Write an enzyme that holds these catalytic residues in place. Structure first.
Site, PDB file in Angstrom:
ATOM      1  N   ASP A 263       0.885  -1.150   0.000  1.00 42.71           N
ATOM      2  CA  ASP A 263       0.000   0.000   0.000  1.00 42.71           C
ATOM      3  C   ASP A 263       0.935   1.215   0.000  1.00 42.71           C
ATOM      4  O   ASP A 263       1.585   1.495   0.993  1.00 42.71           O
ATOM      5  CB  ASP A 263      -0.874  -0.031   1.279  1.00 42.71           C
ATOM      6  CG  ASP A 263      -1.788   1.190   1.486  1.00 42.71           C
ATOM      7  OD1 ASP A 263      -1.835   2.068   0.587  1.00 42.71           O
ATOM      8  OD2 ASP A 263      -2.501   1.229   2.516  1.00 42.71           O
TER       9      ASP A 263
ATOM     10  N   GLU B 246      -6.928   0.141  -4.665  1.00 47.54           N
ATOM     11  CA  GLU B 246      -6.987   0.056  -3.208  1.00 47.54           C
ATOM     12  C   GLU B 246      -8.312  -0.516  -2.709  1.00 47.54           C
ATOM     13  O   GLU B 246      -8.241  -1.426  -1.859  1.00 47.54           O
ATOM     14  CB  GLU B 246      -6.716   1.433  -2.581  1.00 47.54           C
ATOM     15  CG  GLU B 246      -5.270   1.884  -2.763  1.00 47.54           C
ATOM     16  CD  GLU B 246      -5.010   3.375  -2.661  1.00 47.54           C
ATOM     17  OE1 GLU B 246      -5.897   4.132  -2.206  1.00 47.54           O
ATOM     18  OE2 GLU B 246      -3.890   3.781  -3.035  1.00 47.54           O
TER      19      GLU B 246
ATOM     20  N   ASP C  46     -13.101   4.464   3.095  1.00 51.64           N
ATOM     21  CA  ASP C  46     -11.667   4.538   3.354  1.00 51.64           C
ATOM     22  C   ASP C  46     -11.318   5.919   3.845  1.00 51.64           C
ATOM     23  O   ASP C  46     -11.222   6.878   3.058  1.00 51.64           O
ATOM     24  CB  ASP C  46     -10.885   4.152   2.087  1.00 51.64           C
ATOM     25  CG  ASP C  46      -9.377   4.195   2.220  1.00 51.64           C
ATOM     26  OD1 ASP C  46      -8.884   4.653   3.277  1.00 51.64           O
ATOM     27  OD2 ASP C  46      -8.689   3.645   1.324  1.00 51.64           O
TER      28      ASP C  46
ATOM     29  N   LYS D 102       2.402  11.281  -3.958  1.00 55.66           N
ATOM     30  CA  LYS D 102       1.275  10.576  -4.634  1.00 55.66           C
ATOM     31  C   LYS D 102       0.218  11.543  -5.230  1.00 55.66           C
ATOM     32  O   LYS D 102      -0.509  11.157  -6.155  1.00 55.66           O
ATOM     33  CB  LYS D 102       0.595   9.654  -3.627  1.00 55.66           C
ATOM     34  CG  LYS D 102      -0.448   8.697  -4.225  1.00 55.66           C
ATOM     35  CD  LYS D 102      -0.982   7.801  -3.067  1.00 55.66           C
ATOM     36  CE  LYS D 102      -2.031   6.823  -3.532  1.00 55.66           C
ATOM     37  NZ  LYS D 102      -2.484   5.999  -2.393  1.00 55.66           N
TER      38      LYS D 102
END
Length: 377
Positions: free
Chosen positions: A7, A172, A194, A68
């Site tokens: 991850d 994800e 999430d 990211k």
């Protein structure tokens, strides 16, 4: 082999291995089961992960996080131009691509986002090699479901630079569903909720005969656990002012120290109904020792917690689904440990039980590791 899952998160990363039919999530050299996606450049060295995050306040202009948010994008992109306003490091343009610009060894250097993410990935790789012995060759690496092919390829390139065979880039939310074995559990509509430290992603998946399809996505890319901490900081800074007649607001070290205490107190409040704050010499040699309740923490965040239901309703509308048509709800991200968040979500779903038995900050690496094992055979 070995079977490794990564991850690669915007502020924190997590690595798992599939061994003897089960996933082991791997702690780093400081014993942490997640590792900051942080890279720091100093007068002499390059620091990655905990060492990078531990000196962030001391070296904010040369300490990279949120690579990211840039990876796979153009410097001209609206999200890049917007994000740049809130980062203490410089972001520059080379051949229309964004790069972070830093001071390293007394000179100016620039790095593509995949170069920063590769340094994070090398750290995750070394974390797994310390746990396993020998060398790691292959990995499954995860990305948000809404990442486009440029973001996926640039993520892969970070793996390549690292010297990993990237077996597959998977979503994800898909990794999280795989961790719960929802592709083997007896079509299913799956909602993944999430909620991380700085992002909120709601995804609706369908799962049938081991095939995953993303049906809708929604959320807020600038909402997370950090927003909850901000609310506790303001509350306790006001209390300090009320009790000690000292305003810490203009003093960035005192505010930062209060935020550190608040982040930890928040964690305690997911398993206890009160937390103790214990700060020595917060301001002008005056100690700040105090206690905060769970009920006070929920009050200070009433809007932010209830607001998480709006992206759920939106993802349902986009998926063309009624909330009664969701067969599985999966909690992901450290913030979904907050009991009030769990209760608001469960009541919204008419009392439905949540998939929450896997550490929520580990669920994504856990499913990536299961997937790595499948692909390796």
């Amino acid at each position: 082999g070995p079977a490794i899952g990564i991850d690669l998160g915007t502020t924190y990363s997590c690595v798992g291995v599939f061994q003897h039919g089960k996933v082991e999530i791997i702690a780093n050299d400081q014993g942490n089961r997640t590792t900051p996606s942080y890279v720091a450049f100093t007068d002499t060295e390059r620091l990655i992960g905990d060492a990078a995050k531990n000196q962030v306040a001391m070296n904010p202009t040369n300490t990279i996080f949120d690579a990211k948010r840039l990876i796979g994008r153009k410097f001209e992109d609206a999200t890049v131009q917007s994000d740049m306003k809130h980062w203490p490091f410089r972001v520059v343009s080379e051949g229309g691509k964004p790069k972070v610009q830093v001071e390293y060894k007394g000179e100016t250097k620039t790095f593509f986002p995949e170069e920063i993410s590769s340094m994070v990935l090398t750290k995750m790789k070394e974390i797994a090699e310390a746990y396993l012995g020998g060398k790691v060759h292959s990995a499954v690496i995860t990305v948000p479901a809404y990442f486009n092919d440029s973001q996926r390829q640039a993520t892969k390139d970070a793996g390549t630079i690292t010297g990993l065979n990237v077996l597959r880039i998977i979503n994800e939310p898909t990794a999280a569903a795989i961790a719960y074995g929802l592709d083997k559990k007896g079509e299913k509509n799956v909602l993944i909720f999430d909620l991380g430290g700085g992002t909120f992603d709601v995804s609706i998946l369908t799962i049938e005969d081991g095939i995953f399809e993303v049906k809708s996505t929604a959320g807020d890319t600038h909402l997370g656990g950090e927003d909850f901490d901000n609310r506790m900081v303001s509350h306790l800074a006001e209390e300090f002012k009320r009790k000690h007649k000292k305003d810490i607001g203009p003093n960035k070290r005192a505010v930062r120290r209060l935020r550190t205490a608040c982040e930890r107190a928040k964690r305690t409040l997911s398993s206890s109904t009160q937390a103790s704050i214990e700060i020595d010499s917060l301001y002008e040699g005056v100690d700040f020792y105090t206690s905060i309740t769970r009920a006070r923490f929920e009050e200070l965040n009433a809007d932010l917690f209830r607001g998480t239901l709006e992206p759920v309703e939106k993802a349902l509308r986009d998926a063309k689904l009624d909330k009664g048509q969701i067969q599985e709800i999966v909690l992901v991200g450290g913030s979904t440990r907050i009991p009030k968040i769990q209760k608001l979500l469960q009541d919204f779903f008419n009392g439905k039980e949540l998939n929450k038995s896997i550490n929520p900050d580990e669920a994504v690496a856990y499913g990536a590791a299961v997937q790595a094992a499948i692909l390796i055979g």
